[PDB]
Design an enzyme around this catalytic site. Structure first.
Site, PDB file in Angstrom:
ATOM      1  N   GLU A  64     -10.578  40.881 -44.762  1.00  0.00           N
ATOM      2  CA  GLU A  64      -9.883  39.700 -44.265  1.00  0.00           C
ATOM      3  C   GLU A  64     -10.867  38.565 -43.980  1.00  0.00           C
ATOM      4  O   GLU A  64     -10.617  37.408 -44.341  1.00  0.00           O
ATOM      5  CB  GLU A  64      -9.060  40.029 -43.003  1.00  0.00           C
ATOM      6  CG  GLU A  64      -7.880  41.003 -43.230  1.00  0.00           C
ATOM      7  CD  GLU A  64      -8.308  42.467 -43.255  1.00  0.00           C
ATOM      8  OE1 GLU A  64      -9.525  42.733 -43.157  1.00  0.00           O
ATOM      9  OE2 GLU A  64      -7.431  43.352 -43.374  1.00  0.00           O
ATOM     10  N   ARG A  84      -4.478  41.000 -55.081  1.00  0.00           N
ATOM     11  CA  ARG A  84      -4.301  39.827 -54.235  1.00  0.00           C
ATOM     12  C   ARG A  84      -4.972  38.616 -54.876  1.00  0.00           C
ATOM     13  O   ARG A  84      -4.415  37.524 -54.861  1.00  0.00           O
ATOM     14  CB  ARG A  84      -4.867  40.065 -52.834  1.00  0.00           C
ATOM     15  CG  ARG A  84      -4.087  41.115 -52.043  1.00  0.00           C
ATOM     16  CD  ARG A  84      -4.447  41.107 -50.555  1.00  0.00           C
ATOM     17  NE  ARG A  84      -3.994  42.329 -49.885  1.00  0.00           N
ATOM     18  CZ  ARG A  84      -4.655  43.486 -49.905  1.00  0.00           C
ATOM     19  NH1 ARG A  84      -5.812  43.592 -50.554  1.00  0.00           N
ATOM     20  NH2 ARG A  84      -4.156  44.548 -49.285  1.00  0.00           N
ATOM     21  N   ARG A 137       2.366  53.230 -41.928  1.00  0.00           N
ATOM     22  CA  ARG A 137       1.953  53.921 -43.145  1.00  0.00           C
ATOM     23  C   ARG A 137       2.951  55.060 -43.346  1.00  0.00           C
ATOM     24  O   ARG A 137       3.424  55.659 -42.380  1.00  0.00           O
ATOM     25  CB  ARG A 137       0.522  54.472 -43.020  1.00  0.00           C
ATOM     26  CG  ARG A 137      -0.562  53.429 -43.283  1.00  0.00           C
ATOM     27  CD  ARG A 137      -1.968  53.953 -42.982  1.00  0.00           C
ATOM     28  NE  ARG A 137      -2.300  55.156 -43.744  1.00  0.00           N
ATOM     29  CZ  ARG A 137      -2.558  55.180 -45.050  1.00  0.00           C
ATOM     30  NH1 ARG A 137      -2.529  54.063 -45.761  1.00  0.00           N
ATOM     31  NH2 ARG A 137      -2.847  56.330 -45.650  1.00  0.00           N
ATOM     32  N   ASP A 192       3.582  48.666 -47.435  1.00  0.00           N
ATOM     33  CA  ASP A 192       3.980  49.715 -46.508  1.00  0.00           C
ATOM     34  C   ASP A 192       4.188  49.288 -45.054  1.00  0.00           C
ATOM     35  O   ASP A 192       4.773  50.036 -44.275  1.00  0.00           O
ATOM     36  CB  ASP A 192       2.999  50.889 -46.592  1.00  0.00           C
ATOM     37  CG  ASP A 192       1.582  50.506 -46.233  1.00  0.00           C
ATOM     38  OD1 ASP A 192       1.205  49.323 -46.380  1.00  0.00           O
ATOM     39  OD2 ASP A 192       0.835  51.410 -45.815  1.00  0.00           O
ATOM     40  N   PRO A 204       0.558  43.575 -53.219  1.00  0.00           N
ATOM     41  CA  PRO A 204       0.022  44.437 -54.277  1.00  0.00           C
ATOM     42  C   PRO A 204       0.796  45.757 -54.183  1.00  0.00           C
ATOM     43  O   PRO A 204       1.237  46.147 -53.098  1.00  0.00           O
ATOM     44  CB  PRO A 204      -1.448  44.592 -53.898  1.00  0.00           C
ATOM     45  CG  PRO A 204      -1.429  44.460 -52.404  1.00  0.00           C
ATOM     46  CD  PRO A 204      -0.434  43.355 -52.153  1.00  0.00           C
ATOM     47  N   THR A 205       0.985  46.438 -55.305  1.00  0.00           N
ATOM     48  CA  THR A 205       1.716  47.698 -55.282  1.00  0.00           C
ATOM     49  C   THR A 205       1.248  48.560 -56.451  1.00  0.00           C
ATOM     50  O   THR A 205       0.798  48.037 -57.469  1.00  0.00           O
ATOM     51  CB  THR A 205       3.247  47.442 -55.374  1.00  0.00           C
ATOM     52  OG1 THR A 205       3.962  48.671 -55.182  1.00  0.00           O
ATOM     53  CG2 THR A 205       3.612  46.848 -56.734  1.00  0.00           C
ATOM     54  N   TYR A 206       1.338  49.876 -56.292  1.00  0.00           N
ATOM     55  CA  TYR A 206       0.925  50.807 -57.342  1.00  0.00           C
ATOM     56  C   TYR A 206       1.898  51.977 -57.380  1.00  0.00           C
ATOM     57  O   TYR A 206       2.491  52.335 -56.366  1.00  0.00           O
ATOM     58  CB  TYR A 206      -0.494  51.314 -57.079  1.00  0.00           C
ATOM     59  CG  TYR A 206      -0.624  52.185 -55.850  1.00  0.00           C
ATOM     60  CD1 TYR A 206      -1.027  53.517 -55.953  1.00  0.00           C
ATOM     61  CD2 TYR A 206      -0.361  51.673 -54.583  1.00  0.00           C
ATOM     62  CE1 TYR A 206      -1.169  54.316 -54.819  1.00  0.00           C
ATOM     63  CE2 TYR A 206      -0.497  52.456 -53.447  1.00  0.00           C
ATOM     64  CZ  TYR A 206      -0.904  53.776 -53.567  1.00  0.00           C
ATOM     65  OH  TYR A 206      -1.046  54.542 -52.427  1.00  0.00           O
TER      66      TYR A 206
HETATM   67  O1  LIG Z   1      -4.895  51.903 -55.720  1.00  0.00           O
HETATM   68  C1  LIG Z   1      -4.233  51.182 -55.004  1.00  0.00           C
HETATM   69  C2  LIG Z   1      -4.072  51.356 -53.589  1.00  0.00           C
HETATM   70  C3  LIG Z   1      -3.323  50.520 -52.895  1.00  0.00           C
HETATM   71  N1  LIG Z   1      -2.651  49.429 -53.476  1.00  0.00           N
HETATM   72  C4  LIG Z   1      -1.791  48.514 -52.689  1.00  0.00           C
HETATM   73  O2  LIG Z   1      -2.631  47.647 -51.963  1.00  0.00           O
HETATM   74  C5  LIG Z   1      -2.209  47.515 -50.582  1.00  0.00           C
HETATM   75  C6  LIG Z   1      -3.143  48.205 -49.583  1.00  0.00           C
HETATM   76  O3  LIG Z   1      -3.282  49.636 -49.581  1.00  0.00           O
HETATM   77  P1  LIG Z   1      -2.663  50.554 -48.429  1.00  0.00           P
HETATM   78  O4  LIG Z   1      -1.345  50.084 -47.919  1.00  0.00           O
HETATM   79  O5  LIG Z   1      -2.604  51.950 -48.904  1.00  0.00           O
HETATM   80  O6  LIG Z   1      -3.802  50.240 -47.280  1.00  0.00           O
HETATM   81  P2  LIG Z   1      -3.897  50.729 -45.810  1.00  0.00           P
HETATM   82  O7  LIG Z   1      -2.635  51.390 -45.391  1.00  0.00           O
HETATM   83  O8  LIG Z   1      -4.920  51.806 -45.776  1.00  0.00           O
HETATM   84  O9  LIG Z   1      -4.477  49.370 -45.202  1.00  0.00           O
HETATM   85  C7  LIG Z   1      -0.782  48.066 -50.588  1.00  0.00           C
HETATM   86  O10 LIG Z   1       0.144  47.002 -50.793  1.00  0.00           O
HETATM   87  C8  LIG Z   1      -0.734  49.047 -51.759  1.00  0.00           C
HETATM   88  O11 LIG Z   1       0.574  49.179 -52.370  1.00  0.00           O
HETATM   89  C9  LIG Z   1      -2.756  49.173 -54.858  1.00  0.00           C
HETATM   90  O12 LIG Z   1      -2.161  48.218 -55.345  1.00  0.00           O
HETATM   91  N2  LIG Z   1      -3.550  50.076 -55.549  1.00  0.00           N
HETATM   92 MN   LIG Z   2      -0.835  50.015 -45.704  1.00  0.00          MN
END
Ligand SMILES: O=c1ccn([C@@H]2O[C@H](COP(=O)(O)OP(=O)(O)O)[C@@H](O)[C@H]2O)c(=O)[nH]1
Ligand SMILES: [Mn+2]
Ligand SMILES: O=c1ccn([C@@H]2O[C@H](COP(=O)(O)OP(=O)(O)O)[C@@H](O)[C@H]2O)c(=O)[nH]1
Ligand SMILES: [Mn+2]
EC number: 2.4.1.135
Lengths: 250, 247
Positions: free
Chosen positions: A196, A76, A225, A111, A8-10
């Site tokens: 999970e 996802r 991160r 990330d 997932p990505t934003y």
């Molecule tokens: O508003 C959002 C926030 C996060 N993500 C994505 O969803 C995943 C999880 O978020 P993040 O990596 O920030 O989670 P953490 O580091 O806190 O587990 C990543 O692939 C992000 O690119 C997204 O698609 N929309």
């Molecule tokens: Mn992350």
């Protein structure tokens, strides 16, 4: 066997930098299909262009995110829908693999850091495979405890009650098993840290997890991160009409 | 044209993760020699091990700084100038008069493969925009008719070379020609890059790349420090993460 990577990505300042290193990592892995799901209302030219130039086998998906603030849940699940024949492809390979197809699905956030070795470890998954994950859950590494080639417990600490105290990056699922369990998905209403388990509980029991990465003694993935970049200067230049040229993608 | 990537690194929780993605990035680039210099009291098995299994062409060096990786980069420059110092990998530096380009890549930035094809064509010193640095979306020179006429920068614009370490590359011949050119570990904040470049060329002669500096092919990303609250509590209970499992 083919590995389907769900990511997932934003859009945000560091998005492209993250997708550049993730796509470059994936270009090192054979028989890999990238399912990139954008958290948008429609595809963005930034992602569409990067995918097209990546040279990878991919399928572009899109779904907007609608208290616990779980991230990437809807994206996802969208990839799981596509895999189960519910369509949703806005680009790339539009048709998902048919039933009977051998494959493994891995949920890779944009990330984290992934070694190329990790992918060869998950290529052999019958049900649900697992391995240690570095720098996650407030530990140097979190991971299954293995005895006699079997998972007999977990090295964890935060919310040890979790039936599967493992990070998203610490497991992979056989495609046939996901198709065989149509209800298996991520629950956006699950408590913090239980995302999970909301999927895995529908697929297998902890005792049946398949230990990989040399019986869980090697850390092949890290829950890194990226720091939010400082933009103080950009803001000052913008208030003066001299901001960084927006026509130059970052 | 061989590219020599100079990288200072030091032990900390995320070190291996950073070296893994950097080495994996470099594995995609042809004709590249990695000069990895550890800021340690002596070479660590972690780094030696990663280098050995990377499949990359490399030279391993070490020098401690009792910190921006200044001393480590200078030790790579000393080595390049035939002063030896290698403790692993290819010990013999390039012979005098050899062709090549030198790029100083810190271990936490993000580099696209395309970036490396731009610098191979460096006569003296080439430059390009860098994303997410100096407090801007990107920082980079202003180009007019293939010439650098100014810089898009904000943080102390008085620097003669207001560019990040990741935004330039130096031709090997020019570095050998100026054997006294090196980084000044005493240079104030933000003046490190200028401390080297001032010995090599004039800002007006910088060779613009990345399509006359209209493309951002490198990003000054930084990695968050991992939380270790749980690790500490487990340590107290005598069950900290097994030291034998490298992270
Ligand atoms: O508003 C959002 C926030 C996060 N993500 C994505 O969803 C995943 C999880 O978020 P993040 O990596 O920030 O989670 P953490 O580091 O806190 O587990 C990543 O692939 C992000 O690119 C997204 O698609 N929309
Ligand atoms: Mn992350
Ligand atoms: O004590 C130290 C601190 C940093 N570095 C390295 O020197 C470079 C610059 O430091 P850093 O990335 O932290 O700089 P910044 O992101 O703040 O400019 C990087 O390659 C680091 O791995 C080092 O060798 N020793
Ligand atoms: Mn840095």
């Amino acid at each position: 066997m083919t590995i389907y990577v769900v990511t997932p990505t934003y859009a945000r300042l560091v998005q492209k930098a993250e997708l550049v290193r993730l796509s470059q990592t994936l270009s090192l892995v054979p028989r890999l299909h990238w399912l990139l799901v954008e958290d948008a209302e429609g595809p963005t030219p930034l992602v569409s262009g990067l995918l097209a130039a990546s040279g990878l086998l991919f399928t572009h998906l899109v779904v907007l995110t609608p208290w616990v603030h779980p991230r990437g849940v809807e994206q996802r699940n969208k990839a799981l829908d596509w895999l189960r024949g519910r369509g949703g492809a806005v680009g790339g390979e539009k048709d998902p693999p048919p039933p009977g197809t051998q494959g493994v699905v891995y949920f890779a956030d944009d990330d984290n850091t992934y070694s190329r070795e990790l992918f060869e470890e998950m290529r052999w998954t019958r049900g649900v495979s697992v391995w240690p994950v570095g720098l996650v859950g407030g530990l140097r590494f979190e991971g299954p405890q293995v005895q006699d080639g079997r998972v007999v417990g977990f090295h964890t600490a935060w919310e040890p009650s979790r039936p599967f105290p493992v990070d998203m990056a610490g497991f992979a699922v056989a495609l046939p098993l996901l198709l065989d369990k149509p209800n298996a998905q991520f629950d956006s209403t699950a408590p913090r840290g239980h995302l999970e388990s909301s999927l895995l509980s529908h697929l297998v029991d902890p005792k049946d997890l398949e230990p990989r990465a040399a019986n869980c003694t090697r850390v092949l993935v890290w829950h890194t991160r990226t720091e939010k970049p400082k933009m103080k200067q950009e803001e000052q230049l913008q208030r003066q009409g001299r901001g960084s040229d927006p026509a130059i993608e970052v």
